[PDB]
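Final report, results section. Input specification for complex C-07:
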Amino acid sequence: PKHYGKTIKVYEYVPLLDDRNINDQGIDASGATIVNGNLYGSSKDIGNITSKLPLLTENGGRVNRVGFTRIAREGSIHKFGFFYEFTQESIDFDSDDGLM
Amino acid sequence: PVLKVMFHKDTNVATVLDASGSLSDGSVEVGTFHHPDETYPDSVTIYHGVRDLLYKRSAKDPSQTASYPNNIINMQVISIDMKATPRLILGTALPRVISTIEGKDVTWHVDVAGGKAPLTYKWQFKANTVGAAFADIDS
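Structure output:
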């Protein structure tokens, strides 16, 4: 549209289990704050996944908290053009009447 | 193991430490608890232990004790910082019974996670005879 500059932006929402999901909402299964809030992210390692499984006891509590993330994309437009010039004689006296 | 808990009044950060651990950041000692629990090892955890310890300390001054409603009970603003040794967990338990025949080779394997590395393994054998106790398998 008009009056919005030359750029368009859009959001992309990252999945929960993704390495791009970098956030500070993480609380592990024992209730301790952890550096990552995406559980095991994109990991496919069995050992890594096991140590980060959201296990839950019969007493519940503040355990296994997660966070989320999103990304923004953008692009812009540009301007182009060219021209050429001629005289009246270059049209009238030329052999080819279809020159233009 | 016994886990010592330190609390920082200004940052609402509860630090869990080994029994011999210590801090020098102004945090005060609020108590200690057994992890895993001796009577309910798999029904509670460090969060419940810290909550129980904090319930009996004053919100005005964590060094002093207090009763409800003048105690620390709002866990939503409490950050639990884990610095004690990770709990020792038996990842791959052995098969309760193995059946075979004479002349066959038998293999036992165990996977253990947590604890303070390095881990050490010691196997023992107990014969089926009456009154036989566990004896170390000579390495």
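The first strand of chain B starts at residue 2 and ends at 8. Residues 129 and 135 of chain B are 13 Å apart (CA to CA). This concludes the modelling results for the funded period.
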